[PDB]
């Protein structure tokens, strides 16, 4: 029937909105985890490089 | 002591904002210490060897159990070396004069051994002149590249 198909289309629209919101939030989660793997890979690399440099400065001073 | 060691390890002139070009001339350090116990001395020499400064510094150490009259000669022979290195070899000497209150109580001892009339609270009347003859031996002269900058440390008794 007509309103039968209308209610079925409303259920399909709810499922569509649910899956689109799931895609958006999963993309945001993997994005922020990618930036935290990023910028953490920045911070510890710069810290260890500076530790290596300070060790070389102290060795040549000694 | 941590603030004096932090200043000693990160004081740099800014040549680019000043407009005198750029060379980055680092600091020679003259460290006079009068009654450092063992903990302050351990902190200062570990800080200096960790930042790599004992090849640029000269230390006139006077521990807490050493005799309490050579404290009179300790700052004067520190600043003799400082005036020499700044005004006849053109360094940029920074002078850390630790714990001047021990120097002042040493001169109170030698000025109360001689029955001399005191100023305020038993310290003798010429303590202004002694502290002046130590402090005022710093600054910059004309036409010469050197400088003696002074950071003393005082322990205020009743703060």
One DSSP character per residue, A2-62 reads HHHHHHHHHHHHHHHHHHHHHHHHHHHHHHHHHHHHTTHHHHHHHHHHHHHHHHHHHHHH-
Strand partners, B96: B31, B151
Q: Taking Cα atoms as reference points, which of B75, B3, B62, B17 lies closest to residue B35? A: B62
Q: Taking Cα atoms as reference points, which of B136, B63, B66, B72 lies closest to residue B100? A: B72
Q: Which domains are seen in chain A, by residue range?
A: 1-62 (1.20.5.620)
Please name the residue of chain B whose CA is at the shortest distance from the CA of residue A56: B52
- What gap in Å lies between CA A43 and CA A33, rounded to an integer? 15
CB B35 within 8 A of CB B29: no
Q: What tokens does A61 get?
A: 């001073």
Q: What angle do CA A46, A50, A56 make, to 5 degrees?
A: 150
A&B contacts, CB < 8 Å: 5
Where b means 16+ CB within 10 Å and e means fewer, A34-60 reads eeeeeeeeeeeeeeeeeeeeeeeeeee
Please name the residue of chain A whose CA is at the shortest distance from the CA of residue B48: A58
* Beta strands, E only, B21-80: 29-32, 57-60
The label of the residue with tokens 């022979």 reads B77
Q: Taking Cα atoms as reference points, which of B141, B142, B50, B40 lies closest to residue B96? A: B40
Q: What tokens does B62 get?
A: 């006077």
Number of H helices, E strands in chain B: 6, 4
Residue of B26, B52, B53 to mutate, testing the A interface (most A Cβ within 10 Å of its Cβ): B52
Question: Inter-chain contact A58–B50, Cβ cutoff 8 Å?
Answer: yes
* Beta strands, E only, B26-140: 29-32, 57-60, 92-97
Please name the residue of chain B whose CA is at the shortest distance from the CA of residue A60: B52
Q: Taking Cα atoms as reference points, which of B126, B88, B87 lies closest to residue B108? A: B126
CB B106 within 8 A of CB B130: no
- What gap in Å lies between CA B132 and CA A38, rounded to an integer? 58
């Amino acid at each position: 029937s007509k309103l039968e198909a209308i209610l079925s289309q409303e259920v399909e629209a709810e499922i569509q909105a649910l899956l689109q919101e799931a895609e958006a939030k999963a993309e945001a989660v993997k994005r922020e985890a990618e930036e935290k793997a990023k910028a953490l890979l920045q911070a510890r690399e710069r810290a260890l490089e500076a530790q290596y440099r300070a060790a070389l400065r102290r060795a040549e001073s000694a | 002591n941590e603030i004096a060691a932090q200043i000693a390890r990160q004081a740099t002139v800014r040549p680019d904002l000043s407009g005198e070009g750029e060379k980055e001339e680092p600091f020679a350090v003259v460290f006079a210490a009068m009654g450092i116990t063992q903990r302050e001395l351990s902190y200062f020499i570990q800080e200096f060897e960790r930042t790599g400064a004992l090849s640029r510094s000269v230390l006139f150490l006077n521990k807490a159990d050493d005799p309490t009259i050579e404290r009179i000669l300790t700052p004067r022979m520190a600043l003799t070396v400082a005036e020499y290195l700044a005004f006849e070899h053109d360094y940029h000497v920074l002078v850390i004069l630790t714990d001047m209150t021990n120097y002042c109580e040493a001169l109170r001892e030698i000025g109360a051994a001689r029955e001399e009339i005191p100023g305020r609270r038993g310290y003798p009347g010429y303590m202004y002149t002694d502290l002046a003859t130590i402090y005022e031996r710093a600054g910059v002269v004309e036409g010469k590249k050197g400088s003696v900058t002074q950071i003393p440390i005082l322990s205020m008794p009743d703060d």
